Amino acid sequence: EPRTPKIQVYSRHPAENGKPNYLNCYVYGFHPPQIEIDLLKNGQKMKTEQSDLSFSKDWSFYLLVHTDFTPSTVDEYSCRVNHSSLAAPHMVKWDRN
């Protein structure tokens, strides 16, 4: 029985347009552990770094994916997750608010 991932997309620091920042996607609570995660800019895959896969009795499996980014007034950023508990990949949009 799979357990569906939960997905948090956030910037390391409060967003200001045109200032460099870090974009993060934390996904957790899932089983089985095989999972695919990307960060997207306007629907296109960004180059990212991905933490070590880890397990906790309180969180099941969890992973953090992150990259540099510079928010603007028009550019959209999202996290895309594919996992066997899902019928198709899910995307969560970064919301600066």
Residue numbers in the entry: 1 to 97
From the manuscript:
Major histocompatibility complex (MHC) class I molecules (MHC I) present antigen peptides to the surface of antigen presenting cells (APCs) to active T cells through interaction with T-cell receptors (TCRs), which play pivotal roles in antiviral defense.
We also determined the structure of monomer bat β2m without MHC I. And the key residues binding to α1α2 domains and α3 domain of the Ptal-N*01:01 heavy chain are highly conserved in human and bat β2m.
